[PDB]
Design a protein around this ligand. Sequence first.
Ligand SMILES: CCCCCCCCCCCCCCCCCC(=O)OC[C@H](COP(=O)([O-])OCC(O)COP(=O)([O-])OC[C@@H](COC(=O)CCCCCCCCCCCCCCCCC)OC(=O)CCCCCCCCCCCCCCCCC)OC(=O)CCCCCCCCCCCCCCCCC
Ligand SMILES: CCCCCCCCCCCCCCCCC[C@@H](O)O[C@H](CO[C@H](O)CCCCCCCCCCCCCCC)COP(=O)(O)OCC[N+](C)(C)C
Ligand SMILES: CCCCCCCC/C=C\CCCCCCCC(=O)O[C@H](COC(=O)CCCCCCC/C=C/CCCCCCCC)COP(=O)(O)OCCN
Ligand SMILES: CCCCCCCCCCCC(=O)SCCNC(=O)CCNC(=O)[C@H](O)C(C)(C)COP(=O)(O)O
Lengths: 52, 459, 61, 175, 63, 128, 124, 84, 178, 88, 182
Amino acid sequence: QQERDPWYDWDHPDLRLNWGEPIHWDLDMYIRNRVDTSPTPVSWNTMCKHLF
Amino acid sequence: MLKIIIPTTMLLPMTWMSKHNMIWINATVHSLLISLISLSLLNQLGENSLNFSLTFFSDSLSAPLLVLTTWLLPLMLMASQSHLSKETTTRKKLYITMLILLQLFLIMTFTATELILFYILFEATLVPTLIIITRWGNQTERLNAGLYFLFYTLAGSLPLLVALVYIQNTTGSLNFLIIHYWSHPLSNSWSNIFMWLACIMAFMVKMPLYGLHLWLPKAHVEAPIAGSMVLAAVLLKLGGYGMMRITTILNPLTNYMAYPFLMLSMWGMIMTSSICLRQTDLKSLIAYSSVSHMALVIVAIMIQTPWSFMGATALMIAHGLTSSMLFCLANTNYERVHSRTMILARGLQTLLPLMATWWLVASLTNLALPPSINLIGELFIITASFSWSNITIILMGMNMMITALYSLYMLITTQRGKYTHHINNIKPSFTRENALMALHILPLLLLTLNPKMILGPLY
Amino acid sequence: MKMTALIVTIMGFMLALELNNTTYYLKFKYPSQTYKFSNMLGYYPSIMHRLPTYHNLSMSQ
Amino acid sequence: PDSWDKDVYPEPPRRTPAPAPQTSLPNPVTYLTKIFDLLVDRPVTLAREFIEQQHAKNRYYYYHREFRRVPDITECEEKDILCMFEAEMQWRRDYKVDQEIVNIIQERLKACQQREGESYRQNCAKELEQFTQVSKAFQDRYSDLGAHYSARKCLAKQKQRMLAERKAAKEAAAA
Amino acid sequence: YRHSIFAVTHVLIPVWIIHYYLKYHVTAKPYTVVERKPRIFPGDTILETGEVIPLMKEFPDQH
Amino acid sequence: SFPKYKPSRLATLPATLDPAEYDISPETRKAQAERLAIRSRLKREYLLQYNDPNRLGVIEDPALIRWTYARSANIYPNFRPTPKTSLLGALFGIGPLFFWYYVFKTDRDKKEKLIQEGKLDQTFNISY
Amino acid sequence: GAHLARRYLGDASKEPDPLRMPTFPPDYGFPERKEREMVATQQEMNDAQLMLQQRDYCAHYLIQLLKCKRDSFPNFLACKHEQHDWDYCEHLDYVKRMKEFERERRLLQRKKRREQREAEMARG
Amino acid sequence: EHGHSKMELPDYKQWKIEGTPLETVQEKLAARGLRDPWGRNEAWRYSGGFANNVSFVGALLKGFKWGFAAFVVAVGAEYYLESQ
Amino acid sequence: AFSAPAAYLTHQQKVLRLYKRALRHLESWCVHRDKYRYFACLMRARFDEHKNEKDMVKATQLLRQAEEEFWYGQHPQPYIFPESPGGTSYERYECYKVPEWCLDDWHPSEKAMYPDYFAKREQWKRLRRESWEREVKQLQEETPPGGPRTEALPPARKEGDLPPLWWHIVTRPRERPM
Amino acid sequence: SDAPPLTLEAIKDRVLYVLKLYDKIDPEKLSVNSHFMKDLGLDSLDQVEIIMAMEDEFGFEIPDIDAEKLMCPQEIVDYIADKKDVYE
Amino acid sequence: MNPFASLTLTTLTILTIPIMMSNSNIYKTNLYPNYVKTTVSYAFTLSLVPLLMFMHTGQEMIISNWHWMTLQTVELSLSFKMDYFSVMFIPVALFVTWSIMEFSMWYMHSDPFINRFFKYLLLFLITMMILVTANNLFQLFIGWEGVGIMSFLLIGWWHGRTDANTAALQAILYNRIGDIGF
Ligand SMILES: CCCCCCCCCCCCCCCCCC(=O)OC[C@H](COP(=O)([O-])OCC(O)COP(=O)([O-])OC[C@@H](COC(=O)CCCCCCCCCCCCCCCCC)OC(=O)CCCCCCCCCCCCCCCCC)OC(=O)CCCCCCCCCCCCCCCCC
Ligand SMILES: CCCCCCCCCCCCCCCCC[C@@H](O)O[C@H](CO[C@H](O)CCCCCCCCCCCCCCC)COP(=O)(O)OCC[N+](C)(C)C
Ligand SMILES: CCCCCCCC/C=C\CCCCCCCC(=O)O[C@H](COC(=O)CCCCCCC/C=C/CCCCCCCC)COP(=O)(O)OCCN
Ligand SMILES: CCCCCCCCCCCC(=O)SCCNC(=O)CCNC(=O)[C@H](O)C(C)(C)COP(=O)(O)O
């Protein structure tokens, strides 16, 4: 839910959801308070290798 | 002991003779007076017990549970006052009668000098709870829930009865005092193994154990608010009381037999705490938290050390109060929103600040913040288990971390953020609800001043 | 070795000051891997706030 | 203070140095403690004197309960419930008394550690040995009875330990 | 005047209560307040006994 | 050329680096148009229900009800015993129990052996 | 450091290990072997209760520094001579430790040279 | 009490690229046939009290002159007092 | 935010968005104003070389290598305005925003203070009550059949009419309510 | 905070100030309602650069979808007033 | 007698009076932040005295005043350690907090809940004072968890902001990982 458009006028601005649209099965796992899948400037493999 | 039992019985004719608009006032006033009377039982001794007669005796394990049982009834009436407004007078009187019968059964169960009388009342508590769940529940699943809540219990308790009478055929008595004074070791035999299982599983199903916990979310979610309070606060502690009372005759077989149940509880507290993290239901979350706490209490009772028993007593009392408060808060949200889903009603701290304060205090005390009695019981159990084995500390630390995580998750999801725009029927909190939360929370912070009052007979 | 703390302090001072003074130059280059590693906090907050939590939460459901 | 026995809770004579002002500069501590005395200690003392005379106007006493000795669990028949009850009560009282004894020794040890300051490792060896002996005795008495402890379990543990001791002594003599 | 009342109702009354409680109740029990046993240096005199600690071994003093 | 960004599960592909959006076809345009039409119909229904002054209470959302029901009450009727399901259930429900039992049993056996031989040094161990 | 470089990039046997020092008898160098002197006895140094790691041969100057710090309290810059004396005593202690280190190193080098000479004599 | 004094904006013709590094940027841009259309918009950052800058070491030595004068005065007083 | 979105983005919209993002990230890279000006005119010159390009396949080949180049050099820590969705004060005052209907739940003793405000509020409530009944018919007659295709609302066309679905747009709490 | 409560006149003054410092525009030919595409002969890139200038002047960022359809100084002033809740 | 103990306990005691008055009328006025700031300054200047006594003599003290539960041979009591670390850190922390609140009266001037902000700052100060002066592990744990909860409440001060709540829960998570070892 973090990578959804923050400028669209959602019906639930904090959750970034609309009223009648279907809800993801793992919605409570992606609520901008938890794990997000937003793209990063560096590739995931590169970050993992560098940190390790 | 009759000075408490007789007024509870007299609560019934007074309720049935009360005016159509004075049932709640009379019931609340006289229940509070009965609780004040029951407070006298807290004066225990370092000697044997308070043996009133051949039938009823008290103990510093029985007294805190009796006080909590008496104190819970006025809160149950105050919370049930709301959703029973459109009910006929006869049915309101029947609901109050069910509550009074439940209180009387619990009071007579907790004293119960004899084991068969204890069993009779321990099963007698089933009927009013089943009627309350299956008659004044809202959804269509309540009936199913009731079935579960019944049969699970009986599946564990009918063998126990057999074992009990068998013991009375060999020992010659079932009196608690004679059983303790004449206890003999249990030889490691298959017959003794199955006697141990029959004596134990009836109480382990009511805690409940991790493998046998399926009935609890159904019963808690489907029952009305008073049913949820009485289930989470007192009815779960009957199994702990029974195990504490009955493990005396099971030694030394407990050392070998406790391993499967210890493993089940130590892993199930982690499993249920993780389950709480992904929950779309408030009542289900509170129920699973109750399951985790009672798994810890099971570990404490199975380890069978003085610190374990003290911590278990403290944790049962603390969890009863805290879980009742949490269920009350969720019910106050539900009576406004009518959905019972965490994610729908959001940003409630901005609209109801004092209720948000109550939420914060309840979450803090569920999270076992020192010097609350929740933390006292948690820490005593953890220390005893560490003495039992140093590797338990990993599991207990994991459980503490996940408990904090899901408690603050439940607080933040409902109280913080931005309010739901379309929800506009959120009225200011009533004096009744605020008084209910205050009466839930003040005894906890008063008891943290005098912990020895809830530390059991091994203090 | 009595002055090592000092000489390290001034050496860092002058080196960082000289590296900062080049920002006025009218020349631009893309960053290196070391700068990216230092700016994203060694990538520790990324991976460790995405890999464990997910693998926990998913399992919990 | 007479409120507690000096022998049960011993203390050193508490030698303290004399002030030796090497300079004419007047220290803030003496002036501060004098003004504190005047502003705090005197009113507190007067209020205490009033309370003490009020207490003296109404004097009454309470007594420490004494308990007779009763035959213990070794002089009890196998199924005679009355003597077992009395012996169990006596054993529980003795257990509480031993707990308080260990508490007293631990208090002595803690007071030593705080009082002797930087030399506690050497100036508190006596209290350490006292607590070691008392803890050893208490552990031998009650270490592994667990919950549902009783006089019978304690007696069984003692019998097992003394059987082991007798066998070890016999083997050592017959070695 | 504001500070006059403040130093009385916020400092003097509490310090009175704590000093009374410490002097007459806490110190009534043994080992409740334990001191440091102040340092003794050579040449000092004890008020209680009046004796003096002998001086040191007159080490060779130079620079 | 520049080093390629490799997407992952927890770091998805950027919106502007997709190969898909750059491939525009009339069918894709029609799909986007009907997606916007569905979204606008839902938005119009919600706003009509939302701006009504006679409205009181909460605007019931069928999507949320479906989500909660599918997460809670639609699992077992759609469950099917499968080698994947059976193996995963057996592992995740039995393996931890036996692993922890082995660990604790071994630890307590070592402790019992040490206390039997007397080389455990339990001095000052009084509370348990 | 240079000793670290000489030990880690050279051979181990030329220079000592600080853990096992000294490895030679005291009077192996010279036979008179004077004893180190102490000024503060047990009782008064315990009474001043300095610290366990502070109870070295420089204890007396520390005692006098503490006496100054206690006596001329408000003038916390009054007694500076005693601080200098205690610093000088610790300097002498450290210098003696360095001298011990160098003495052990030279003894080790001499032993290695004697062993090499004996081996060469045996070979010839 | 708030800031209601009806502040008036300065004259736009005041801001000139001349005398600023924006001139140097314009000169480099003219060598390739380019011009900046927003050059005058950023001139105010180099015009008023922002025209005069200070170095790093100058910033570190903010009050060294007064401190040094007071130091030498105090040292002279101490030398003239102790020599008595 | 205020305007309704479109079904898709045209090529020129994507080019303008990439220009915006590239200029912002170049400004983030070049802290000083003169350096940023120099490199911004350079980037504008590099942008306008393909301004008159007419091949749409070549136009799509362009801007795409450009997005890749931008992603390579995108300054992992760009400057964000404090109130923007990434800023340090994005939703600071969202906790001070209280709905207007809460005022209907106030005690009469609270409404005794501020009487003029509640009189004007009653006037607003009357206006909303009439206007909504007009607006429902307006939107029903104006909407295309089969349902709306774009979430854009028509303006008012009569004299006494008000824009359909106006109440919750006009009565926003505030940008800084407290 | 201590931020003066800016008004419509101030917003219009600052917008016209920034536009008058845009040397691509002749200051004496610009007006409040003067269009950008036709009345001023400006490119779309020029319009977006004007959006940058407004953003950096007022300290808040305009979303692209709203910004790309702003073609007159008056409607820019109106948009900024609506964003900032300006009374007069 | 020996004003060290009385002064050391009085500092912490008067640190709590504004929390008691938080339900009084002064909490509903704009004089509350100044009240808390003055209380902190008075506490600092009152705690400067035991520091002077320690500097003069080296005075150290243990004050086990209130007796909590006793579990068999284990005795738990409300006991304060007044060693060099406590009597040195208390004045420094009080001075820093006094400066912080004086700066807060200007920084949070436009915050509607400024009295609650100062109440939160004072509660954190009380919990940290409990942490520093603790003589046993249970009291130290009480302070340990009190400062953590107070940091959780203060980090998510703007509870309408998602990232603030995320940061607060992050702090709680890491501090619980530490509490495991505690
Ligand atoms: C014994 C004799 C004693 C004397 C010793 C010699 C005396 C001194 C000699 C000087 C030595 C080096 C000093 C210069 C440092 C470099 C500065 C620089 O040029 O930065 C620009 C440059 C790139 O800048 P950019 O990307 O273009 O950024 C664009 C803008 O400029 C962006 O700019 P901005 O505006 O955003 O911010 C500017 C910022 C941004 O700049 C940066 O990005 C900083 C990043 C690099 C600088 C950090 C150097 C510290 C090294 C610590 C390494 C620890 C171990 C790590 C192990 C990693 C394992 C994989 O730069 C700074 O603020 C200043 C940089 C720090 C310099 C001041 C202090 C450093 C001196 C101390 C170092 C050692 C002396 C110790 C003293 C005591 C004596 C013993 O940085 C580099 O090129 C890196 C150079 C060195 C990095 C070494 C790490 C490489 C690792 C590769 C892999 C190796 C194999 C591992 C195998 C593992 C497999 C298991
Ligand atoms: C569903 C969620 C949980 C529900 C509750 C679960 C808890 C109940 C589990 C009962 C605990 C174990 C039962 C018996 C334990 C005895 C110890 C035995 O297992 O160990 C070995 C026993 O060896 C083998 O285990 C023999 C028994 C094998 C047959 C039992 C079935 C094994 C798996 C069945 C589990 C199903 C449980 C649920 C039933 C519905 C030791 O060898 P041995 O020295 O010779 O026997 C010692 C006992 N003696 C002295 C009396 C003879
Ligand atoms: C929550 C649902 C779980 C249900 C509870 C299941 C656990 C209870 C154990 C099963 C029933 C056993 C009841 C035994 C009653 C006690 C009497 C007793 O122990 O006496 C034994 C009797 O022992 C037996 O007869 C046991 C036979 C069991 C027959 C029924 C078996 C039921 C299924 C057992 C399999 C499950 C085992 C583990 C269940 C754990 C719960 C899942 C000695 O008999 P005598 O002949 O008189 O002695 C003289 C010779 N020494
Ligand atoms: C630091 C980050 C680095 C970023 C690197 C970015 C790469 C820079 C190079 C970009 C390459 C290109 O120009 S990509 C070139 C793509 N092809 C075209 O642009 C052809 C037709 N152009 C249009 O129609 C436009 O809308 C236009 C006429 C410009 C305006 O129109 P307006 O009249 O409606 O304003």
